[PDB]
Ligand binder design. Sequence first.
Ligand SMILES: [Zn+2]
Ligand SMILES: [Zn+2]
Lengths: 170, 126, 340, 550
Amino acid sequence: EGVEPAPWAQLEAPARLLLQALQAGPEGARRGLGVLRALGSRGWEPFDWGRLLEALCREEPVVQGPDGRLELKPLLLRLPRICQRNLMSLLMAVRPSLPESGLLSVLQIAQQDLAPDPDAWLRALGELLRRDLGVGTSMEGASPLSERCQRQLQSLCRGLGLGGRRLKSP
Amino acid sequence: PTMLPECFFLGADHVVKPLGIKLSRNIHLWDPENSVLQNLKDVLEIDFPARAILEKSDFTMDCGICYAYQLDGTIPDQVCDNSQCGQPFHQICLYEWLRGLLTSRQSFNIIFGECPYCSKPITLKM
Amino acid sequence: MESLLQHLDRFSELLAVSSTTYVSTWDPATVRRALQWARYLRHIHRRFGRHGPIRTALERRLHNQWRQEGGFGRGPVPGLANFQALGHCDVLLSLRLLENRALGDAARYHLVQQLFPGPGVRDADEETLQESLARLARRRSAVHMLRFNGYRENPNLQEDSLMKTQAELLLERLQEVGKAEAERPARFLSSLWERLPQNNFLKVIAVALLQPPLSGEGSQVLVHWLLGNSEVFAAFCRALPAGLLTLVTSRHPALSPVYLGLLTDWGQRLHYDLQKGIWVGTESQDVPWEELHNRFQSLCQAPPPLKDKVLTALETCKAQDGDFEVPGLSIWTDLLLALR
Amino acid sequence: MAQDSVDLSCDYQFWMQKLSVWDQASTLETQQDTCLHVAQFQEFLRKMYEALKEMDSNTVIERFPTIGQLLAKACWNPFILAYDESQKILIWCLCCLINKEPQNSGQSKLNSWIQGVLSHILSALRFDKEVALFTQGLGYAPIDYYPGLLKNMVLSLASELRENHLNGFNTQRRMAPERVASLSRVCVPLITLTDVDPLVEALLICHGREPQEILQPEFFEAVNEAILLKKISLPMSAVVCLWLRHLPSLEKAMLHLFEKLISSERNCLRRIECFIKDSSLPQAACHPAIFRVVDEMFRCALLETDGALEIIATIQVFTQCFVEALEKASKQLRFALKTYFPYTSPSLAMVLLQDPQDIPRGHWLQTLKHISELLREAVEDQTHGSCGGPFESWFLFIHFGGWAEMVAEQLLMSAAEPPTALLWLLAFYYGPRDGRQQRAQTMVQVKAVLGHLLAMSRSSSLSAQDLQTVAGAPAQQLIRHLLLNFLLWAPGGHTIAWDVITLMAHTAEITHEIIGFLDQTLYRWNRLGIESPRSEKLARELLKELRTQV
Ligand SMILES: [Zn+2]
Ligand SMILES: [Zn+2]
């Protein structure tokens, strides 16, 4: 009646482990690693990240909010939220070892530009991958954080006598 | 590459100490003209064994979900009825895996359902 | 030891009359006296409550009080229920006096002032009465909110909460009577049967049979009560769901053979009509085909030690009513076929 | 002493108009609204008690008009009655509002209406009919099982919600999240109530599968506050998965760390190690997300203050405890330090992780002198395949307490021929981003002052003006901190300490700076265990006496 199979049901089996694994609470991220070493040890010694990096961006249909509103969601926002947060962890963990083409397609989504209720976390780890690639200096106020944070931290730094250190170079 | 790597140690907490200490002492005696091994042999003041066991090197004799031995007195005990997987598991890990999957089906105090690694019938009796 | 009997029994009398509306005579003196006696009991409960012959002596006085009063005649007074109720006697007393409208106005002011000073004794080393009373309202309003914003009747009554808990109130309330050995559980459960709502009651009992042991003498007593009194057990099998009776049986095999006995006895007061292709009863209350299919459905859908039993009890009542191998003759052929 | 009734009589009409909105909050939004504003309601009520406490009942008509109906609405609403002491307070209110001797029937009618309300709170059967009948017959009054009852209800949900987890894509009863939502509104009022912990626990671990969040952050913020005031004390797994799924709670625990180090407990670094360890932060920080976000709020404070020594000390404590909670739980499967601090050489971190307790006091010069040489290559030869910039290589050095601070105290011990490596290192610490022209000048100003100070140490116990001459600019904190090092190290100190301190403490800023310096120096020593009892007792005395002066 209301069976849905997981979004990764149709995928090539080792993805299905990776993301099956990252479903599971905050140690998701090791388990993701655990899987990578456990598939260097099984017969497909490689894992085709360009398979998985397409699959993530590709969109499918969803009908949510009311009973009636058609939208096109990509995989990344559609799959389990804890699998998001750890994926993104793991990708700082193997950033070197992915092609750029895919990453950038991921991030752009991540940015969650032009959403109501963006996902803080994702945006942030988006930022923290941009800042590791060397292409998302972004020339903005683009730091992982909330504005409401940024300001409350300036507000308390101000209650202290500045260090003679020189760190800004105008 | 030749530069010092981040390196850290698994095994007996008693055996790990002196090596972890001598590293601390000898780290400034790293050099990038000699190889990684020709720096490591004279830094840790040891030799390594040249495939000490090449057949049973190590079988990750670990849960294949949590990748740990000893989950709460449970050992990697629960296995696959398959020559090509043979992957141990724990009761708890494998129960929380197969019960989540759609494929698996539950008898009275048994779960028949797919081995995570190889997708073959595996049975769990609680 | 005997110093505490004279204290506690006179306190019991005082407590019993507390909620009774003759409160005119009362004053701050009575309230002070009550609460200091209650503090003393609360200190007793604390100090020498655990691993005493004093412990067991007090319970004997308690449970003998609760059986000589009965729940019968002059008044069905609760009283302070048991060994744990020594620890919060005070609060029971407090709650009851407030409900009591006959409470004179001077006593109510001094009372409330003594219960809730303020934060003038915010630094109090013992949890005073004030803090327990907050805690109450809190859990209490707490339980409201869960009940109406996330509680549901589990279908497997065993894995509900209200039932599961009311059972445990019953088990504790028979564990005490068993130790006492003054009246047998039988008499208690007979009186119950008259007094309280039956549908409710049975489900409790049903689930009580299943709760794994807490000191299963409890479960073992209920089966003797049931098998002893046939008339109630007829209503039981009739009132519950199927899976409940299935698990009743596989746990307690003393129930298999008489339950099956009741189905045998219901099947044999049907009759077929040809024109609607269905078994139906004569009388309006006669468990329909629908219901009877289902329960045997279940009983079969059970562990091996019952499935064989019941399946053989079918083949035997089939042969007794002619070994036809065609429908429209033997209710029991029908069933055995309907199980594939 | 200015207002009396005015601010209170305004907020009364705000609240009375809002209680009439909410009214027993048997809907979703009545509840969210109640859920948030409740706290201010509590403070209103404290002010209201003070107002009702000072005066007496039936006599005054201040807000006695509608107070009945305010406290009715409040009471019949249970979302209120679950918050900290609101119920005790509302009782304290009513205790004022009764009369002992009611004379006009209005006062008696109020008193009756209050007995009604109290009974409604305390001893009312607004729960399931069957269970009441059963128990009353059994011979219980509600009180004596309410507890076990409750706990049961919970452990049903607790367990049930745990099951919803285990069915990760099973053709089964998906417990509809609207119930989940429901509870989460119920847990905020009563996070402080002991007999619910487990429930909480099993909501904050079993996220499951939805694209979207399904709880509300009224809940994520409620949890936060009772954690960091330590009024729930959860298991560690609970709170990591909490951070990990409402990022502004994690930011908001870090602020709640800053205010400890900035406002209340300036330079009590034992209380700060206490706060880091009794927060689970080091723990959460095993997780490459959480630490990356932490370090960046740490980075934004390092800039707004241009290197507060007190903010630097709290980083040295964080690293400390991070490493040795990382160490612990990480034998198999930990994330490689190019993952935590990705902006610098893995090599350099791998050196600087090696703690100085587990090195000889004699092999600290070796270690430092090597660190500096590789830093010199990472900063000055800023080439392709290195750091982004110096900043990041300094930010590496900060995190490591022991190393940064030990340069100075080792320069004094090698004042005869100071090593250029350490001079450069130290000028780098007290000033990164200089130009090599400026760093050469800094090193040689320091070398001149090493000559003067070594002459003065090898001399007798001399004046303080001779030292303030060499002190007399943009390298001031370099020289002052080195000179304090001199005072505490040399046996000629403990005599003309005060003479120098009083001169150098122009302002309060300098005093607070040196208090932090001393507490850091002493936490560093007591940790590594290394002491001259002279310098210990001296530093303690001066720290004690200066914290009065400020
Ligand atoms: Zn395991
Ligand atoms: Zn297998």
